[PDB]
Symmetry: C2
Subunit: 161 residues, 2 copies
């Protein structure tokens, strides 16, 4: 099961968008699609892939085009949607998932509209929980490519280069 | 298990959106309230507006961060990528009765009882917070306020709301 993120609606939003993309990466996503660059965010994210490893991508595309040709299950994280645990078994059954995080037709074009509780909060939080429950990787993730690794400790900041 | 957040390092010129995200995540996922090492009247009004309308008694208040740590009556948990993976400390955390989780000065690492990582890659303090509260409290899908002026009713394709 491969997961991809669609980031709709960014507007120069520079710090939340990088947060979304680095969350996507940290949590097991293969890459992230944007409905507009913005070269600040693209660089920030490309810097981390280089220092910290792997081949997570980030690229601008036509968001409606992407939603229309993918190619696997399409999921929209929205406060107004169906709680995740109700659809999880069906989401896990997919081979490829496009998860969309923010436009009326997004609700129509996506296969499922899913909520991470029904309170207002963060698309960064919504995504963190989705990918944690869906991929189960955040704790096991590492990259052999990496030039900076963390080794966990009780109260230090231990890094390998 | 009641959980408080302490948000360190907010810069009014910069951090308004993320700090609002952090606070609202604290509330959505079951934390009792959040402390900031500085007001920021503007972020506080956003949060308070949300509590007024969406319900409950989640607070936001400014403190001196050192004083609050030094005199927090419970387990102080600091969320950092340099920390011990939450799975190894999770039962210890859950056994406590009050938890202060710290989201971002080196003395923090010495002042907190535990330093905890949500994975060892750089991501987001909102994401770290989200996953922490979801695993620790397990409340995000069960949380609702009967006293609320506004409530969402989940739908397959729509935006439905009781007011």
């Amino acid at each position: 099961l491969e997961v991809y993120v669609l980031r709709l609606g960014h507007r120069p939003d520079k710090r939340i968008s990088t947060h979304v993309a680095l969350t996507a990466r940290a949590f097991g996503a293969k890459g992230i699609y944007f409905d507009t660059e913005d070269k600040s965010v693209f660089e920030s994210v490309r810097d981390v892939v280089e220092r910290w490893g792997g081949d997570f991508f980030i690229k601008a595309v036509s968001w409606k085009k992407l939603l229309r040709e993918f190619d696997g299950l399409k999921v929209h994280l929205t406060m107004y949607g169906i709680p995740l645990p109700q659809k999880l078994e069906e989401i896990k059954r997919a081979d490829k998932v496009l998860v969309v995080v923010g436009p009326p037709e997004v609700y129509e074009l996506c296969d499922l509209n899913i909520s991470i509780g029904t309170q207002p909060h963060s698309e960064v939080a919504a995504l963190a929980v989705f990918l944690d429950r869906v991929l189960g990787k955040v704790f096991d993730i590492s990259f052999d490519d990496a030039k900076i690794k963390v080794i966990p400790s009780e109260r230090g900041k231990r890094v390998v280069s």
